[PDB]
Amino acid sequence: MEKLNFGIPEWAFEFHGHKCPYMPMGYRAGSYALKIAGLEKEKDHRTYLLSEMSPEDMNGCFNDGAQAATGCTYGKGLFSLLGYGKLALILYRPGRKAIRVHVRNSFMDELSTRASDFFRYRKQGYEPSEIPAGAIDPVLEWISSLEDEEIFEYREIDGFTFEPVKKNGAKVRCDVCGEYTYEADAKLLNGKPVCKPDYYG
Amino acid sequence: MEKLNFGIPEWAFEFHGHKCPYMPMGYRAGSYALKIAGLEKEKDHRTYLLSEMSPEDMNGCFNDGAQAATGCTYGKGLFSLLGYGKLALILYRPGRKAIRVHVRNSFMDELSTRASDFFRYRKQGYEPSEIPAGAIDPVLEWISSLEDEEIFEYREIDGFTFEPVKKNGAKVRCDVCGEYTYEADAKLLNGKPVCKPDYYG
Ligand SMILES: [Zn+2]
Ligand SMILES: [Zn+2]
Ligand SMILES: [Zn+2]
Ligand SMILES: [Zn+2]
Ligand SMILES: [Zn+2]
Ligand SMILES: [Zn+2]
Ligand SMILES: [Zn+2]
Ligand SMILES: [Zn+2]
Ligand SMILES: [Zn+2]
Ligand SMILES: [Zn+2]
């Protein structure tokens, strides 16, 4: 698709399912990383995107936006988390210096004020779909009015290296349940391929 | 957005970036899991989706489709991989029996024949965007012509339990670099919060 809501494609909101400040921020961050790199969105498996967040962080919606803006998705094996707890992305394409993008602390301080209504709802436990548009639309409008430079900082990293997980497409029927199992995940039980649930159980 | 290409929303293809058989299969699987469960797409953080694939499996594009169909995304903390190497999903909403959906081996055998052109290109190393439409469009048309029952099997699991990762939104300025760091990922160095890169380096 192709049409914008608060400067973010409408499709990105349909993927994510709701309006919140972090998915747009992640989208903006991913777009900015590409602009800096002089790259277009990734259609295939060439460029890597690493988020500095961890699974324990709230606001992981940032990662949906980042994947959405760059085409470096978790499913394609191009998106991963480093676990540092920072609102930052590292775009890396082998043979080039990686680009790190960080959301400014000063932007975060202003977002806390600007989006206090939205965050008060979230603190009480209301899911984003239950939050009134008046509490979120002005925040997204504000974010869309800012230049990339007002939200983010960046730098090139010199010695960055990253080797992704080695992938394998071969499959074999599990000896116990009969289901096709990717060889990479099959266990051997007396010379026969067995899926993990049947091996360990 | 809202318009279909081969029975899959056009937006899902823009997110993923290219045409391949597995993203649509994952989309179909996720949609079927919801239909069986009697649930609508997840706008927020209520339902969990677990893929039985691992990061070492080729065809992880299945996972983009699954997230896209269900609204159970990796960014929202609702999507995870179990690492069994099966083309299967488990939809789970606390207080109900989980639903497991498996892509039939027989469907996989027919896909190998039906999509031999596409897979020959992939075996040579051509990325999906470089593959001619004639090698992929008839495969997607075929998939759209099949009923859910022709592609998948399902079952309810009785004793399924899953506790997601405990999340925390609090942040503190790292004592060394000054960057806001989610407390959940901060290290303590003589009573001061330090981000992992500054702690370990
Ligand atoms: Zn969100
Ligand atoms: Zn910074
Ligand atoms: Zn107010
Ligand atoms: Zn609620
Ligand atoms: Zn098995
Ligand atoms: Zn794909
Ligand atoms: Zn089966
Ligand atoms: Zn041919
Ligand atoms: Zn190529
Ligand atoms: Zn630090």
Author numbering:
A (entry chain A), B (entry chain A): 1 to 201
According to the publication:
Molecular replacement was then used to determine the structure of the I222 crystal form at 1.87 Å resolution. The final model includes one protein molecule (residues 1–201), one unknown ligand (UNL), five Zn atoms, six ethylene glycol molecules, eight acetate ions and 129 water molecules in the asymmetric unit. All three crystal forms show zinc binding at the same two sites, suggesting that these sites are functionally relevant (note that two of the three crystal forms, C2 and P42212, are devoid of exogenous zinc in the crystallization conditions). The I222 crystal form also showed four additional zinc-binding sites, which are likely to be attributable to the presence of zinc acetate in the crystallization experiments. In Q9HJ63_THEAC the zinc-binding site on the NTD is situated on a loop connecting the N-terminal α-helices (α1 and α2). The UNL is only 1.8 Å from the S atom of the conserved Cys61, which is consistent with a thioester bond between the protein and the UNL. Two significant structural differences between Q9HJ63_THEAC and Q2LQ23_SYNAS involve their metal binding. First, zinc is bound to the putative active site on the NTD of Q9HJ63_THEAC, but is absent from the NTD of Q2LQ23_SYNAS. Second, whereas the structure of the CTD of Q2LQ23_SYNAS shows four Cys side chains within coordination distance of the Zn atom, the structure of Q9HJ63_THEAC is atypical for a treble-cleft zinc finger in that three Cys side chains and an Asp side chain are within coordination distance of the zinc. A FATCAT search of the PDB shows that the structure of the zinc-finger CTD on Q9HJ63_THEAC is similar to the individual treble-clef zinc-finger subdomains of several eukaryotic LIM-like proteins.
Here, the first crystal structures from PF02663 are described, representing two bacterial and one archaeal species: B8FYU2_DESHY from the anaerobic dehalogenating bacterium Desulfito­bacterium hafniense DCB-2, Q2LQ23_SYNAS from the syntrophic bacterium Syntrophus aciditrophicus SB and Q9HJ63_THEAC from the thermoacidophilic archaeon Thermoplasma acidophilum. Two of these proteins, Q9HJ63_THEAC and Q2LQ23_SYNAS, contain two domains: an N-terminal thioredoxin-like α+β core domain (NTD) consisting of a five-stranded, mixed β-sheet flanked by several α-helices and a C-terminal zinc-finger domain (CTD). The proximity of fmdE to genes encoding the catalytic subunits suggests a role in methanogenesis for proteins in PF02663. Individual proteins within this family display differences in domain architectures, metal-ion binding propensities and dimer interactions.
